[PDB]
Amino acid sequence: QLSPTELTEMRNDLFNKEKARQLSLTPRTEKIEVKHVGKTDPGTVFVMNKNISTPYSCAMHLSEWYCRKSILALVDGQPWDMYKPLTKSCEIKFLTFKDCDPGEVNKAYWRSCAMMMGCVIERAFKDEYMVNLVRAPEVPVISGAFCYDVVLDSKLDEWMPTKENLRSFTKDAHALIYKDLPFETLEVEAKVALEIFQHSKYKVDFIEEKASQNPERIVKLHRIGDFIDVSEGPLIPRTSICFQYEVSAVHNLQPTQPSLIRRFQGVSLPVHLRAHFTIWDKLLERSRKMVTE
Amino acid sequence: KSDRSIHLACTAGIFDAYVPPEGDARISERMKKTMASQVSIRRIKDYDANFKIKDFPEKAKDIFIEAHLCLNNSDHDRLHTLVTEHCFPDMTWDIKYKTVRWSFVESLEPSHVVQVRCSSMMNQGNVYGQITVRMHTRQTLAIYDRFGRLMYGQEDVPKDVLEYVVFEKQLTNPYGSWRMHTKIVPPWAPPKQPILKTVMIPGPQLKPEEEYEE
Amino acid sequence: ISHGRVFRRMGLGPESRIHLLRNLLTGLVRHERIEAPWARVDEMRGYAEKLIDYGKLGDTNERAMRMADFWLTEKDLIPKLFQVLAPRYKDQTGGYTRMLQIPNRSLDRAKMAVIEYKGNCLPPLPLPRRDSHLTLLNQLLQGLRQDLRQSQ
Amino acid sequence: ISRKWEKKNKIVYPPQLPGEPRRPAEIYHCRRQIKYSKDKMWYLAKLIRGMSIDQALAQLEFNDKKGAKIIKEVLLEAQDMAVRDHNVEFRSNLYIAESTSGRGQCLKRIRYHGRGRFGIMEKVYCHYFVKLVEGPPPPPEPPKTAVAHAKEYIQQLRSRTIVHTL
Amino acid sequence: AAPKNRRTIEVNRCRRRNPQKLIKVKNNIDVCPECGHLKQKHVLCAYCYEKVCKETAEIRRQIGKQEGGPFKAPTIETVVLYTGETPSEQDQGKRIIERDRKRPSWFT
Numbered sequence A: 001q002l003s004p005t006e007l008t009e010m011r012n013d014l015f016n017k018e019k020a021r022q023l024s025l026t027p028r029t030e031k032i033e034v035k036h037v038g039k040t041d042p043g044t045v046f047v048m049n050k051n052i053s054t055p056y057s058c059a060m061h062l063s064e065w066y067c068r069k070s071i072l073a074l075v076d077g078q079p080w081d082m083y084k085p086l087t088k089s090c091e092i093k094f095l096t097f098k099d100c101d102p103g104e105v106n107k108a109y110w111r112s113c114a115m116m117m118g119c120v121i122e123r124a125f126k127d128e129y130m131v132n133l134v135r136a137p138e139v140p141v142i143s144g145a146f147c148y149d150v151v152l153d154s155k156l157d158e159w160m161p162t163k164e165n166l167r168s169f170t171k172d173a174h175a176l177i178y179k180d181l182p183f184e185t186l187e188v189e190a191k192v193a194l195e196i197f198q199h200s201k202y203k204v205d206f207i208e209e210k211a212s213q214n215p216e217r218i219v220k221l222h223r224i225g226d227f228i229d230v231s232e233g234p235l236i237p238r239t240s241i242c243f244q245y246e247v248s249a250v251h252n253l254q255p256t257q258p259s260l261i262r263r264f265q266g267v268s269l270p271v272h273l274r275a276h277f278t279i280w281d282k283l284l285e286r287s288r289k290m291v292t293e
Numbered sequence B: 001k002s003d004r005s006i007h008l009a010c011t012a013g014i015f016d017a018y019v020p021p022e023g024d025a026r027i028s029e030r031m032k033k034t035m036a037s038q039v040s041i042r043r044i045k046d047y048d049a050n051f052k053i054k055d056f057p058e059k060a061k062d063i064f065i066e067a068h069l070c071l072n073n074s075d076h077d078r079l080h081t082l083v084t085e086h087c088f089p090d091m092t093w094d095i096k097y098k099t100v101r102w103s104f105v106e107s108l109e110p111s112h113v114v115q116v117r118c119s120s121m122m123n124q125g126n127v128y129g130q131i132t133v134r135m136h137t138r139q140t141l142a143i144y145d146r147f148g149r150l151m152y153g154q155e156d157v158p159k160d161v162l163e164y165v166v167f168e169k170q171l172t173n174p175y176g177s178w179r180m181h182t183k184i185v186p187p188w189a190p191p192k193q194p195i196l197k198t199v200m201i202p203g204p205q206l207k208p209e210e211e212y213e214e
Numbered sequence C: 001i002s003h004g005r006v007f008r009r010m011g012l013g014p015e016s017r018i019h020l021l022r023n024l025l026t027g028l029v030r031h032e033r034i035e036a037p038w039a040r041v042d043e044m045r046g047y048a049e050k051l052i053d054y055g056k057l058g059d060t061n062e063r064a065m066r067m068a069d070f071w072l073t074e075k076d077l078i079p080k081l082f083q084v085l086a087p088r089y090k091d092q093t094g095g096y097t098r099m100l101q102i103p104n105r106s107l108d109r110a111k112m113a114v115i116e117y118k119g120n121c122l123p124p125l126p127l128p129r130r131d132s133h134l135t136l137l138n139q140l141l142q143g144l145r146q147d148l149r150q151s152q
Numbered sequence D: 001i002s003r004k005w006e007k008k009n010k011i012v013y014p015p016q017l018p019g020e021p022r023r024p025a026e027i028y029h030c031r032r033q034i035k036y037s038k039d040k041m042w043y044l045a046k047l048i049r050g051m052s053i054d055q056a057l058a059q060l061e062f063n064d065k066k067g068a069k070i071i072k073e074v075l076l077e078a079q080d081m082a083v084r085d086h087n088v089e090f091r092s093n094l095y096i097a098e099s100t101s102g103r104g105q106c107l108k109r110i111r112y113h114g115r116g117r118f119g120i121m122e123k124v125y126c127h128y129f130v131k132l133v134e135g136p137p138p139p140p141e142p143p144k145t146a147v148a149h150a151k152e153y154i155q156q157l158r159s160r161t162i163v164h165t166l
Numbered sequence E: 001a002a003p004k005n006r007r008t009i010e011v012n013r014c015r016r017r018n019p020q021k022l023i024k025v026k027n028n029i030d031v032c033p034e035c036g037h038l039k040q041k042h043v044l045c046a047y048c049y050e051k052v053c054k055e056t057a058e059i060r061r062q063i064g065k066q067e068g069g070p071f072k073a074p075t076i077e078t079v080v081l082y083t084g085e086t087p088s089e090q091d092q093g094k095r096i097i098e099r100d101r102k103r104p105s106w107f108t
């Protein structure tokens, strides 16, 4: 058994080694051409560096308004992270929170907020007890909350968190928001992913599911500081794109045997779409109600 | 209507350009081509009977190396003596506020005199002779910024180069010399080394009444 | 003290204020969209909607005819208030004009306004549109609305 | 006159060693003999001081002064020569380091007063100077905390020496 | 009443650089979604407004060409038809104003 600190630096070391391996895979500067086909600033060519430059780099070439209001990228029709390096000549279209159809931005925001909740859960409980994370399900943003399923210790099978503990979770999440960490992204081989999450069986199963879904068995790993998690899609650029955040409730799921999978639920809203206190309180209660997938 | 006119010491163009041959770099009518050349070479030796075209290529390489080394120290006086007035602005204007670090490692193959042509007499009483020389050397280049930051190239790494440098001497002038006039870059030339920064090409800035028609 | 003073001290006096607003109204009836200083446009907006109400009273009403004769200086617009504009708004009860703020005038930096009679034939103004129903906040509130409709 | 601000955009620095910080880009621009008062240009230039280039251009685009329009033109020109001639990569990675105004060469013109009297009027001209530096706008100096005020007080209660003795 | 003493540059800097005299920073600036130019969130976009105004001015120029003279407003309604558009059955008895361009995408 590695101590949780040693597991953290191990996973960080493997992540850094793989990222440096891709940066070594492309050593000589190569120039790609990205065509801006968004409505505003129409037909604008960016001449970018291959596997180095980002949709954020194109946004910095345009203006600070693009940098601060661009949450996702549409690279050749597919949703791209803003801090994910660009691999080919393509067409780009920056996606904001207040478009006509913000659905992919909503999904990316809900996945990012779930990831942060998972980091808080992993580093909240005391050293004696055992914390494992299964998955963050894809729950519609019309349901009321983002969710993470955590298997806790058998010493704490009878335990339910108090409101003080839930607010402590919320304070840790706000500490992450204040820390303002980029959401780093890595496309990786299933072998390297399995290596990173070797000591975690639920992560093995989920990695195998995503690797089965894609032909070359490349999965998506995101890192926020020292936490690394497997994802089911792109994420928002920074933890500071959260303004209102709350870990609302913890619900114990039906089949208690063989083990207790506990659903931690939360609700969040960005800086660009922040709500008043009355409306946010009502959203808090509706997130405290249980979400079913 | 003054009797004083500008005493130009060069021309503004290339006399009967050497269309570089396709395959000259990929592979490691001739009588007329080398006929025009011999006729002209004799014209040059009419104007100075101590010229050897077997002696030019080493002189051309020396002029090349010393001119481009002036670009390193900014010795514009020596440059005006080893390069023409047509070649001075398009060698200095883009480096004015930049630091150019150039070097000559070696020569892959010896230089060849590959074309010699001469102008007519009716250029103001002045007759010019223009000689094309092929070069295939190995050079280094590192162009720095106003603030000392790298823009282009690598400091130590030598890279191969093929250039068709056209030298010119004004033959009627009593103190004329062989100086670098232009150089031909082939239309089939390999693409140059990529730059070290990202570039945004702006789209059409449209007036409000205009509509973006792709 | 100017408590409960609903009108503006405009122009060279009260008649001058009425004549400035009359010329603004004549321009609005002729062109169906004009731009002017913002305060003048507000003060005129009220009169623009009462003019449509008199037009809806109609051309055989002698009071309505007299009032249109006063407020329309060009006299070709009186047939137009009664046989074009008043009919366009026979279905609406009272919301006939739209007033919006347009930048600032580039001579004296005055607050400016555009006013249009709804309907129109002109290109549409770039109206302020609320946020879409598909944004994050609106989707969360619709989830709240559906759950309330279920629970009650 | 003196025109030293335009020779500042011509300092060539020695090439940098490969282990040193990158050295941000500096761009000096200025407009001379503006028909405006320096005392009103001061408020416009103190408003755009320390801002990002885009934030500055927003504030100047919606400010109501003739000087705001002139300073917008000067800022846009400076951004263009930044990424045209000084090798700035992103045109949004700039901030206003310095923004001031100077007196220009003015003209004196008589202003007929009553009686038999005259006043001399000044046709005022000004200069506007701007230095752009590559980078994000630097973080503002945070306000002093009670802990920082107390630590300063205790340093002074501990720096006290016995005066005028051995 | 005249100044009894000259006012110093220190007193004058306090008066002229007091925060009340400084320009306040604005926070109502937002990007227009349709053109990307900067707008104030309570005022119509300038670029879009002058686009609309220039098309309206062309339509008003053609209206006067048809009306032909002063005091000749119509008693019927009006409709703007572009190149390649026939009058609709609803746009029957309406003065048709023809314009020699494609219908702008923002005009319906």
Ligand SMILES: [Mg+2]
Residues within 6 Å of the ligand: C010, C011
């Ligand atoms: Mg008045």
Ligand SMILES: [Mg+2]
Residues within 6 Å of the ligand: D115
């Ligand atoms: Mg007199």
Ligand SMILES: [Zn+2]
Residues within 6 Å of the ligand: E032, E033, E034, E035, E036, E037, E045, E046, E047, E048
């Ligand atoms: Zn707009």
